[PDB]
Design an enzyme around this catalytic site. Structure first.
Site, PDB file in Angstrom:
ATOM      1  N   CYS A 222      14.298 -44.497   3.760  1.00  0.00           N
ATOM      2  CA  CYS A 222      12.972 -44.907   3.224  1.00  0.00           C
ATOM      3  C   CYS A 222      13.223 -46.208   2.474  1.00  0.00           C
ATOM      4  CB  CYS A 222      12.300 -43.908   2.312  1.00  0.00           C
ATOM      5  SG  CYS A 222      13.520 -42.969   1.400  1.00  0.00           S
ATOM      6  N   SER A 223      13.003 -46.204   1.148  1.00  0.00           N
ATOM      7  CA  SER A 223      13.331 -47.321   0.299  1.00  0.00           C
ATOM      8  C   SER A 223      14.746 -47.174  -0.318  1.00  0.00           C
ATOM      9  CB  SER A 223      12.306 -47.522  -0.765  1.00  0.00           C
ATOM     10  OG  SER A 223      12.615 -48.700  -1.487  1.00  0.00           O
ATOM     11  N   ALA A 224      14.954 -46.097  -1.088  1.00  0.00           N
ATOM     12  CA  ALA A 224      16.201 -45.765  -1.684  1.00  0.00           C
ATOM     13  C   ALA A 224      17.048 -44.899  -0.718  1.00  0.00           C
ATOM     14  CB  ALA A 224      16.039 -45.127  -3.063  1.00  0.00           C
ATOM     15  N   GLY A 225      16.401 -44.227   0.227  1.00  0.00           N
ATOM     16  CA  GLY A 225      17.133 -43.371   1.128  1.00  0.00           C
ATOM     17  C   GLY A 225      17.539 -42.042   0.556  1.00  0.00           C
ATOM     18  N   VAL A 226      16.702 -41.512  -0.338  1.00  0.00           N
ATOM     19  CA  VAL A 226      16.942 -40.241  -1.004  1.00  0.00           C
ATOM     20  C   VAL A 226      15.727 -39.314  -1.035  1.00  0.00           C
ATOM     21  CG1 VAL A 226      18.892 -41.088  -2.463  1.00  0.00           C
ATOM     22  CG2 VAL A 226      16.568 -40.990  -3.460  1.00  0.00           C
ATOM     23  N   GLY A 227      14.500 -39.853  -1.186  1.00  0.00           N
ATOM     24  CA  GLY A 227      13.330 -39.074  -1.564  1.00  0.00           C
ATOM     25  C   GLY A 227      12.631 -38.528  -0.312  1.00  0.00           C
ATOM     26  N   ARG A 228      11.866 -39.368   0.349  1.00  0.00           N
ATOM     27  CA  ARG A 228      11.258 -39.012   1.624  1.00  0.00           C
ATOM     28  C   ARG A 228      12.323 -38.733   2.696  1.00  0.00           C
ATOM     29  NH1 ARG A 228       6.913 -44.108   2.053  1.00  0.00           N
ATOM     30  NH2 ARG A 228       6.145 -43.934  -0.126  1.00  0.00           N
ATOM     31  N   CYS A 505     -23.802 -34.534  14.553  1.00  0.00           N
ATOM     32  CA  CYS A 505     -24.688 -33.624  15.304  1.00  0.00           C
ATOM     33  C   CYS A 505     -25.672 -33.181  14.266  1.00  0.00           C
ATOM     34  CB  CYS A 505     -23.912 -32.447  15.985  1.00  0.00           C
ATOM     35  SG  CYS A 505     -22.596 -31.623  15.001  1.00  0.00           S
TER      36      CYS A 505
END
EC number: 3.1.3.48
Length: 567
Positions: A222-228, A505
């Site tokens: 991700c950004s840091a490569g830890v969270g997501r 509808c």
């Protein structure tokens, strides 16, 4: 010891317990996570390596780091901020790494090459709410050189909630050429975690099918490569686990992850999300079908299995199972008390100073196959929300309206006539001039000029009113509805609309849902040759409740998908 596996049967209850009293036990469970051992991080801290770290506080443990071959005469050239992470009985199944920096683009590619990875998972948008999360480490087109790897963009598929890019890699000197696919999830919110796991789970299914079963580790960042990055890994590893094992151990796997990279699963919300996604994943099973197998799939759905008293079709449908909408001054603005837009996807009007709730209309943004917010799903206007309707269209640059009901059916008023015919109408600041009316066999096309009185500006609005939907049941053939969908969409491209198609509808869920379902499904059939009606519906229901109200409605989508395959 102390946090044992959870059988997939108890997953429901367990999750609700963790969530009890504003996630109190979730929080205590999460805060207790501890690999309970000492690591070192000497390489990350080498002076020459510090600027290779996007965040100084997010480092790579020495014992699990990804080690690059050195570059003769360049100190520090073995280093990247990346660590192997285990899957479920899958050693070093993943590489968790930061989003590469300009100075580390060459390192990142060399990592992919040397590690023989075939798949990259990018869990972020390049930028999110002004803030750069990751810099672009791949070419806009053609070939670019990074370090000594030539990266060629072969192909870009870009859809509502993610993109897939195909690359060829070639290191100079060898004839070796290697294929790599980047899956980029684009629908993670700027703040917190996704409200529903459905987009992510479909994203994950994509990834897993593309990833060759003999490649090196999947590179995840991700950004840091830890969270997501952490959430992706745990969810995947647990979906693997439940195939041979039918229990889940999130706690245990995050604990193992923490001994491999600092901070894996970085927030409680992420920890919660993991549980919600896994919960939803055991809920459905696989409902996706290759075009060639569609008919057979349908035939199988059509049978009452030995054991069950209903069809597979109806069992599949069964498995698919509000702040502003409630504010007392908006309560007359809803056709049905129990059909309200979600707060998160609702279409808010430009507030009008000094009339509370004039930002409300019973309407919901809905994603398409290719782009987000490709539709507004809303109820048939009331005489009292007519004006609101017209303003919604203007404010949201919607110039295509799909009406899926007659004004009256079964001797009940279904929709108020919110458009002029004989002469001009003024609905607040908007002047709407009736320009033409085309009577087709199965629908009516009405064309209007809408002039903003305040500034004299003007747009063409086109309304498609389908008139062939039987007043009880569903069409016997999907032919006319297919052609109808076709016409609406031709008309969309042809006069270059960017805005959403507004669809209604009466309550704006049932037929509305079928229309949106098929609009998506049929394009996905064109471009992928697969169909997954259930997931399409599941998705719509993340953006508006009760989309595709009835079994017959659901079955009709299958029917039409089938007939369309016919051509």
């Amino acid at each position: 010891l102390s946090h044992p596996p959870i059988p997939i049967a108890d997953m429901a209850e367990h999750t609700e317990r963790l969530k009890a009293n504003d996630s109190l036990k979730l929080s205590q469970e999460y805060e207790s996570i501890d690999p309970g051992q000492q690591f070192t991080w000497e390489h990350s801290n080498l002076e020459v390596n510090k600027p290779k770290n996007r965040y100084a506080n997010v480092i790579a443990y020495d014992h699990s780091r990804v080690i690059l071959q050195p570059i003769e005469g360049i100190m520090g050239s073995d280093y990247i901020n990346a660590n192997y992470v285990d899957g479920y009985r899958r050693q070093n199944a993943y590489i968790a790494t930061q989003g590469p920096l300009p100075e580390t683009f060459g390192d990142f590619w060399r990592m992919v090459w040397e590690q023989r990875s075939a798949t990259i998972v990018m869990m972020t948008r390049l930028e999110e709410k002004s803030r750069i999360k990751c810099d672009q480490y791949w070419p806009n087109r053609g070939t670019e050189t990074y370090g000594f790897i030539q990266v060629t963009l072969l192909d870009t598929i870009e859809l509502a909630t993610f993109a897939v890019r195909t690359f060829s890699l070639h290191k100079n000197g060898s004839s070796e050429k290697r294929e790599v696919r980047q899956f980029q999830f684009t629908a993670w919110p700027d703040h917190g975690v996704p409200e529903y796991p459905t987009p992510f789970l479909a994203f994950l299914r994509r990834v897993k099918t593309a990833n060759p079963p003999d490649a090196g580790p999947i590179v995840v960042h991700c950004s840091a490569g830890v969270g997501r990055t952490g959430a992706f890994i745990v969810i995947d590893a647990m979906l693997e686990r439940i195939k041979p094992e039918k229990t889940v151990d999130v706690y245990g796997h995050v604990t193992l992850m923490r001994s491999q990279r600092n901070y894996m699963v970085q927030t409680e919300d992420q920890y919660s999300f993991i549980h919600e996604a896994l919960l939803e994943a055991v809920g459905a099973g696989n409902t996706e079908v290759p075009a060639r197998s569609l008919y057979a799939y349908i035939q199988k759905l059509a049978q009452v299995e030995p054991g069950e008293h209903v069809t597979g079709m109806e069992l599949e449908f069964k498995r698919l199972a509000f702040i502003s909408a409630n504010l007392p001054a908006n309560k007359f603005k809803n056709r049905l008390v129990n059909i309200m837009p979600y707060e998160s996807t609702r279409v808010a009007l430009q507030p009008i100073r000094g009339v509370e709730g004039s930002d409300y209309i019973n309407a919901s943004f809905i994603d398409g196959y290719r782009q987000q917010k490709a539709y507004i799903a809303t109820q048939g206007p009331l005489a009292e929300t007519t004006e609101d309707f017209w303003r919604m269209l203007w404010e949201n640059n919607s110039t295509i309206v799909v009406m899926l009901t007659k004004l009256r059916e079964m001797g009940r008023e279904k929709c108020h006539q919110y458009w002029p015919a004989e002469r001009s109408a003024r609905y607040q600041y908007f002047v709407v001039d009736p320009m033409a009316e085309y009577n087709m066999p199965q629908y009516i096309l009405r064309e209007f000029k809408v002039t903003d009185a305040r500034d004299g500006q003007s747009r063409t609005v086109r309304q498609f009113q389908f008139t062939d939907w039987p007043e009880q049941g569903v069409p016997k053939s999907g032919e006319g509805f297919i052609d109808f969908i076709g016409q609406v969409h031709k008309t969309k491209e042809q006069f270059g609309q960017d805005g959403p198609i507004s669809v209604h509808c009466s309550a704006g869920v049932g037929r509305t849902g079928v229309f949106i379902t098929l609009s998506i499904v049929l394009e996905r059939m064109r471009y992928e040759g697969v169909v997954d009606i259930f997931q399409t519906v599941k998705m719509l229901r993340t953006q508006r409740p009760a989309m595709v109200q009835t079994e017959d409605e659901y079955q009709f989508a299958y029917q039409a998908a089938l007939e369309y395959l016919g051509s």
